[PDB]
């Protein structure tokens, strides 16, 4: 009535979506999270791209105190293959 969601059978199902978490885990060093200053951070966009950024910006110092997430990337499209 208020939030405006439809009934169950009318809940849309629009294509597909994939999410990856980009982290500072170094796959060549047993996925230990890297730390240090981010010199460069240039994030993509365009159609079918959603970014939910953590702490990643040019100048930011990744500390050892917290999780290693930099940015969540989602893509979406009509077809899974796209």
């Amino acid at each position: 009535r208020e939030i405006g969601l439809p009934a169950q059978s009318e809940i849309p199902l629009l294509g597909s979506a994939i999410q990856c978490r980009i982290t500072t885990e170094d796959p060549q060093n047993g996925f230990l999270p890297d730390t240090g200053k981010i010199d460069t951070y240039r994030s993509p966009g365009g159609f079918g791209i959603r970014l939910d950024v953590g702490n990643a910006y040019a100048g930011y110092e990744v500390t050892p105190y917290f999780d290693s997430l930099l940015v969540k990337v989602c893509t979406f499209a009509n077809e899974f293959s796209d």
């Binding site: 230990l32 730390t35 240090g36 050892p64």
Partner: protein, 81 residues
């Protein structure tokens, strides 16, 4: 406080410290021949241990750190030829 020699940026003959910490153990000394992957020394960052491995086959030129020494990012640990 005499500043420490830094590793040259983009010089693959020079291994610089990647994070601040200290030197626990040195396993080689000047002149030794060495193979890719071979352990050269051990360091710590927030009491987590890292082993420094040789980036490729070659001869050790020198050490630039001593046992228990403190180190900051970019500090030159060892030179290889």
């Amino acid at each position: 406080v005499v500043a420490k020699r830094k590793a040259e940026t983009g010089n693959p003959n020079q291994i610089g410290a990647t994070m601040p910490g200290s030197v626990l153990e040195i396993l080689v000394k000047a002149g030794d021949k060495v193979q890719k992957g071979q352990a050269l020394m051990v360091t710590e960052a927030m009491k987590m241990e890292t082993t420094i491995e040789a980036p490729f086959d070659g001869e050790i030129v020198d050490l630039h750190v001593v046992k228990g020494e403190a180190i900051q990012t970019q500090d030159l640990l060892i030179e290889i030829n």
